Design a protein around this ligand. Structure first.
Ligand code: S3I
Ligand code: S3I
Lengths: 236, 5, 236, 5
């Protein structure tokens, strides 16, 4: 690792600087270096890791969608042939995206998940594992697409089971996990009814627990509750 | 696209 | 060059795809590969090259400014020491920015400028040379800062002399060159009066020539004229 | 910052 010679604390400091500068590739590289120091991550550090790679893969996904759309049009009836270039460049972006996903999944497997014993860390990492298998699923078309989808499902399911046993229904990690697993159902697993049921049940159970919260916790929970409602409105 | 976090 | 095995036309096609996907680093790499094929660039191709590197260096400059601001605050009276990390990371971004500028200047010197004989190409490339020396000047602090500033000035001046002899006052390249040389005067050369004089004279001479233009040429020229006015409003 | 193109 090119970050092997840098202090852990310096890597975390520079990840925060990179965030302020909107340099998310750098941020991700710094946080990968921090993970590879081998110590567990604090709550703040876990969110630095997720923010960094979410921004990196988010841009890749947006670019892949643009290129896939152009490629699909080039393959409609009546479209002038323009050669292999659209497919090639879509493939280039796709391979880079798969590489980022594999990197994140590698960090989770070596060895963040196995050392995560508290619910807040273990659910967080298993949600990430589901998310990055979901991004692999979005571009998958081969012999292993079903296995990629089931890897996402399995990670989300383990995270869901822990979150329901160990966290209140308003916990923002529990809420965000449910939000994203619901999207997995709708967009990946061809299960819109499951997606809608999960979003609605998560929203209603959170609603009933808001009375227990401080003003600041209320703000955090209702933010994600509104995303659940937004998706329900999109889907119904 | 739908919202994820 | 990693693009040496790709067809020139394929590189241009993929630069356009990268633009649509907002993948400007890729766009720049494709257009560098196209330049290194050794043929002159068409008008469209010149603008693909400039759009690509402008976006790349633009992001670097924005990040450098964020980091420089943080570094300046860390050096105020009363600020807690936090170690070498802010300086180190500012330096990292600065070195990457200088590398991009050197790459662009290298393409202009090998061999775009020497083969550019028409005013539209030669003024375009000399404007670029001034621009990328200006970006080097923005971060320069050493023994060669004056020489970097004079390299920018010299390129802009040669471009200005050609543009005044060979292009109408409404030509958008002539206008954009004047806009940017005016900013050079204001922000780099500590010459706000020269900056203001150049912007105003350029605006007024363009105004007087608009009557000769088609509707579409009028739109192009008045767009940049409005940027001149915007800067004049900022400065007065 | 001022405008450049
Ligand atoms: C589990 C999950 O996927 C999820 C669920 C909810 C959620 O909500 C929002 C508001 C978007 C969030 O980020 N809340 C948050 C919570 C706790 C810590 C931090 C944080 C610490 S450091 C840092 C940084 N950017 N420097 C940010 C942020 C985000 C992600
Ligand atoms: C000289 C100079 O620095 C300058 C001066 C003016 C100026 O004005 C705006 C409107 C911003 C511009 O871009 N005009 C323009 C002109 C001619 C061709 C193209 C073009 C061909 S291809 C392509 C692409 N993006 N695929 C874009 C664009 C930009 C740059």
């Amino acid at each position: 690792g090119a970050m092997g010679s840098m202090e852990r604390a310096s890597l975390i400091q520079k990840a925060k600087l990179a965030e302020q500068a909107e340099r998310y590739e750098d941020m991700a590289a710094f946080m990968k270096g921090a993970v590879e120091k081998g110590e567990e991550l604090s709550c703040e550090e876990r969110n630095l890791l997720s923010v960094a790679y979410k921004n990196v893969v988010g841009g890749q996904r947006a670019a892949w969608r643009v290129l896939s759309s152009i490629e699909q049009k080039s393959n409609e009836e009546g479209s002038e042939e323009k050669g292999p270039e659209v497919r090639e460049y879509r493939e280039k972006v796709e391979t880079e995206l798969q590489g980022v996903c594999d990197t994140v999944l590698g960090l989770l497997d070596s060895h963040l998940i196995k050392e995560a014993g508290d619910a807040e860390s273990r659910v967080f990492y298993l949600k990430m594992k589901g998310d990055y298998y979901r991004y692999l699923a979005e571009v998958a078309t081969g012999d292993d697409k079903k296995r990629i989808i089931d890897s996402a499902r399995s990670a989300y399911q383990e995270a869901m089971d822990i979150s329901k046993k160990e966290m209140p229904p308003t916990n923002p990690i529990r809420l965000g996990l449910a939000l994203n697993f619901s999207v997995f159902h709708y967009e990946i697993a061809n299960s819109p009814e499951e997606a809608i049921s999960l979003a609605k049940t998560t929203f209603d159970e959170a609603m009933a627990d808001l009375h227990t919260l401080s003003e600041d916790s209320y703000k955090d929970s209702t933010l994600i509750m509104q995303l659940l409602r937004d998706n329900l409105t999109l889907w119904t | 696209f739908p919202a994820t976090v």
